[PDB]
Design an enzyme around this catalytic site. Structure first.
Site, short mmCIF file in Angstrom:
data_model
loop_
_atom_site.label_atom_id
_atom_site.label_comp_id
_atom_site.label_asym_id
_atom_site.label_seq_id
_atom_site.Cartn_x
_atom_site.Cartn_y
_atom_site.Cartn_z
N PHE A 18 0.99 -1.23 0.11
CA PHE A 18 -0.03 0.03 0.23
C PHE A 18 0.79 1.19 -0.01
CB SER A 85 14.51 14.31 -8.78
OG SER A 85 15.16 13.34 -7.95
CG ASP A 130 16.19 -4.72 -5.43
OD1 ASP A 130 16.52 -5.78 -6.26
OD2 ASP A 130 15.02 -4.33 -5.42
CE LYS A 132 14.12 -3.95 -8.96
NZ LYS A 132 13.21 -4.88 -8.71
CG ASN A 135 15.49 -0.15 -8.44
OD1 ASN A 135 15.74 -1.05 -7.50
ND2 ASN A 135 14.41 0.35 -8.37
CG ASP A 148 13.86 0.36 -4.45
OD1 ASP A 148 13.57 0.29 -3.27
OD2 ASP A 148 13.50 -0.73 -5.15
CB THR A 162 15.29 -8.06 -8.43
OG1 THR A 162 14.52 -7.02 -7.91
CG2 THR A 162 14.66 -8.76 -9.73
#
Ligand SMILES: Cc1cc(CNC(=O)c2nn(C)c3c2CCc2cnc(Nc4ccc(N5CCN(C)CC5)cc4)nc2-3)ccn1
Ligand SMILES: Cc1cc(CNC(=O)c2nn(C)c3c2CCc2cnc(Nc4ccc(N5CCN(C)CC5)cc4)nc2-3)ccn1
Lengths: 276, 276
Positions: A18, A85, A130, A132, A135, A148, A162
């Site tokens: 959420f 940003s 993480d 990738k 991101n 992230d 991931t």
């Protein structure tokens, strides 16, 4: 101290748990922000307070053009708002799929930006964990903006990222370090040149199984110097990966032959190469 | 917390007292900042602590695209450093002299930006008190960036600004208010259209003397709607100037016929008109 009423919220840029990132325009300024909105209840129920707190803390310490910036925070009864940003051009992944795979000039430019952002992040004792193409966002000017940081680690086990970008030592020693990001870096370079990530299978178990065996190969026309760099990042022993402390950091990584023509000093003011 | 050693200092952008604005490039980021440097000794000897403190405090509260931004402060044994946005294109005054005077489209666009910045500044209860084309800087994109907040007043006598832009009530009642800035605004509009400010003489006494008598005139081809607006700003009674509280603020000023075609909401994202 800003409030929801200071903004006209527009389209959703992404959704989690959420959770929502919404494009918002500030009424007083006409400035666009990407506002991350988090439901305090779900954070508390899911025991995510240390993570949300870490995210805000890491982003506040970051001051570099290749990272998403935190301009402001506020909260109401239900929700936390982070003003970030806005990267107009979305995900690097969008571009990898669109053009199929990058030519050598484009691979070199965008790898150099990522290497240069990592150098900064690693110099502050922060590991991403993480990393990738989803991101790695692209701004209006087509420069990277990495995001992230919820799952980042500030160095003084636990989180695995991931599947396709997980490093062997995470699957084996439950240990994470700067070389975990350097592994993801080799997977990303391979993905830019090849069009797909190196470890692919029907499910996670099968991907993990290939990772720990180093079971991937290069397509035949893979840029020779990029392959050499990838082979020095995709190394099972995390202390032998180019860029890590045991190998004397970023200097040797940046001196790699693949980067011969790169001017490392002002990448964000260089005009990026056109994606094909 | 940054230090002098984090930057390569370059050219001097301006010099005061014992004061300097220097263009600096941050080594870690390649970002350019305009760094204001102030000698603590001279600030103390000249009793300028309340002023330097006010400058830092006002700039920290400002978050609007038409104002110079304060990104960071630091200090060493001798000096205070303020890291400010860098306005590549320099002073509006440079452009007034270069092209002589602005056409109607250019006068309208740049007046609207200044009006819009004032609305924001005045809405925060801050008055500038030394507004002039030297203090209205232009960024890479040719949008305004207003600066020089040392002499600003935060509303809960003393400072008179640059002679040509001083309002009558400053010369007569020792009183300063939002209408003091609106007076400077009328002097600036006149200056854009005419090429020179309205009250000109051999010395300050003689300029002050014309100001309090409202002794100026319009050149014959002065844009009729600009003249009407100027005549409603250059008003001796400060409570009858368009834009002030007694006249119901910025709404009527922004509704002025000179601004008919202006879209007030997103000026900093509009492409400015070419200066001639
Ligand atoms: C909701 C959520 C996210 C996360 C991790 N993601 C972000 O923080 C994040 N996610 N996004 C989508 C952003 C950010 C950082 C702040 C941020 C700033 N700019 C953009 N730009 C952008 C623009 C378009 C897209 N698209 C176009 C629509 N497309 C179909 C999907 C991607 C994606 C990103 N995106 C973001 C964790 C928990 N909950
Ligand atoms: C030294 C000093 C100044 C002040 C008031 N001025 C500034 O704060 C100020 N002064 N300048 C020159 C700046 C600022 C704000 C921060 C700031 C940011 N960008 C620019 N850009 C800029 C670029 C070129 C010029 N030029 C080109 C060289 N030319 C011959 C003169 C003007 C002027 C300004 N300029 C400034 C009070 C006390 N001491």
């Amino acid at each position: 101290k800003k409030r929801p009423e200071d903004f006209k919220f527009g389209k959703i840029l992404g959704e989690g748990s959420f959770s929502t990132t919404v494009l918002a325009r500030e009424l007083a300024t006409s400035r666009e922000y990407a506002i991350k909105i988090l439901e305090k209840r779900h954070i508390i129920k899911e025991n995510k307070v240390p993570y949300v707190t870490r995210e805000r803390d890491v982003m506040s310490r970051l001051d570099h053009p290749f990272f998403v910036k935190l301009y402001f925070t506020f909260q109401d009864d239900e929700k936390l708002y982070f003003g970030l940003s806005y990267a107009k051009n979305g995900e690097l992944l969008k571009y990898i799929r669109k053009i199929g795979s990058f030519d050598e000039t484009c691979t070199r430019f965008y790898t150099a930006e990522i290497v240069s952002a990592l150098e900064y992040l690693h110099g502050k004792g922060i590991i991403h964990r993480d990393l990738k193409p989803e991101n790695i966002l692209l701004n209006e000017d087509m420069h990277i903006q990495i995001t992230d940081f919820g799952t980042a680690k500030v160095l003084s086990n636990s989180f695995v990222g991931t599947a396709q970008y997980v490093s062997p030592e995470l699957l084996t020693e439950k240990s994470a370090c700067k070389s975990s990001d350097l592994w993801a870096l080799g997977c990303i370079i391979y993905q830019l040149v090849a069009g797909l990530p190196p470890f692919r299978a029907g499910n996670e178990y099968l991907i993990f199984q290939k990772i720990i065996k180093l079971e991937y190969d290069f397509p035949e026309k893979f840029f020779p110097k990029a392959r050499d760099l990838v082979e020095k990042l995709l190394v099972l022993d995390a202390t032998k990966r180019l860029g890590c402390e045991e190998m004397e950091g970023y200097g040797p990584l940046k001196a790699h032959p693949f980067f011969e023509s790169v001017t490392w000093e002002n990448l964000h003011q260089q005009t990026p190469p056109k994606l094909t």
